[PDB]
Design a protein around this ligand. Structure first.
Ligand code: ZN
Ligand code: ZN
Ligand code: ZN
Length: 178
């Protein structure tokens, strides 16, 4: 096994995957690492099994069809993984916790959103369809773009959104386009 957490790249109290070399802090893994379960398999491994069980799940899909899917267990899992892939970039620190807004010349967003709120929402099964989760994720970056305006800090939102969007297309096997 690895000696650092796969998500935040730090040592500490790590739980080790039994089917791959990855390790995790308790609250870095999504869902939070399960109390018992020996052996234990991480979210990377559980996502690989889904693909291996239904190879055709990797044929191309339309985004509009993906978004309307109900949050059954396998879609729940894929959204948790996509969220985890965003937390794996260090720039996610800017979007993790509840923001506040007091900048000369700007007004705060009507609907604030942050990664830990989306985490809790997933955890509490508040999304009924994929669309619910993707809308909140995209709103995080859209709020940041609007508030920071021409400050070069807006770029952090573009960068972390690109990580989200690349992973969304991968995880949900979105049809490749020019
Ligand atoms: Zn960690
Ligand atoms: Zn694993
Ligand atoms: Zn099959």
């Amino acid at each position: 096994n690895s000696n650092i957490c796969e998500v935040c790249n730090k040592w500490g109290r790590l739980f080790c995957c039994d089917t791959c070399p990855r390790s995790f802090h308790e609250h870095c893994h999504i869902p939070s690492v399960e109390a018992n379960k020996n052996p234990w398999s991480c979210i990377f491994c559980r996502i690989k099994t889904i693909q291996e069980r239904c190879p055709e799940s990797q044929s191309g899909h339309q985004e509009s069809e993906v978004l309307m899917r109900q949050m059954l267990p396998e879609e729940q899992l894929k959204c948790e993984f996509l969220l985890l892939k965003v937390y794996c970039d260090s720039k996610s620190c800017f979007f993790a916790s509840e923001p506040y807004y007091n900048r000369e010349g700007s007004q705060g967003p009507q609907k604030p959103m942050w990664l830990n709120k989306v985490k809790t929402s997933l955890n509490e099964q508040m999304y009924t369809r994929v669309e619910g989760f993707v809308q909140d994720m995209r709103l995080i970056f859209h709020n940041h773009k609007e508030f920071y305006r021409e400050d070069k800090f807006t770029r952090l939102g573009i960068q972390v959104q690109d990580i989200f969007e690349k992973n969304f297309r991968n995880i949900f096997a979105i049809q490749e386009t020019s």
